[PDB]
Amino acid sequence: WQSARELLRDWPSQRHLADRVQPLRMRLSELEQRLNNQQNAERLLSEFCK
Amino acid sequence: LRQRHTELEREVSRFEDQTQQQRQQYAQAKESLTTLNRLIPQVTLLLDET
Secondary structure (H helix, E strand, O other), X not given: OHHHHHHXXXXXXXXXXXXXXXXXXXXXXXXXXXXXXXXXHHHHHHHHHO | OHHHHHHXXXXXXXXHXXXXXXXXXXXXXXXXXXXXXXXXXXXXXXXXXX
16 A cells, blocks of 8 residues: 555656656757867867966 | 158058058957857857757
8 A cells, every 4th residue: 555655656756757858858968068168178278278 | 852751751651541441451350350259169059049
């Protein structure tokens, strides 16, 4: 009884949160460019300082 | 020598003018370049018109 209640507790949450996957895809892709460009500019500045 | 003065003055006037315009154009060149420097490096990529 208790376990099943916990399962059906999660189930609403499960679908609701899984809906967000695709937004998260674009989010992660977009932040990747932050990573990449930060690294690139780090190059550039180090090369200049040299 | 006064005729020399007038002719040298003509030439110097020409150079003064040529400089006066020229510098406008090339200052504007570096200015537009600054505009690009502001825009492209990352802004064109996050303002990628999503």
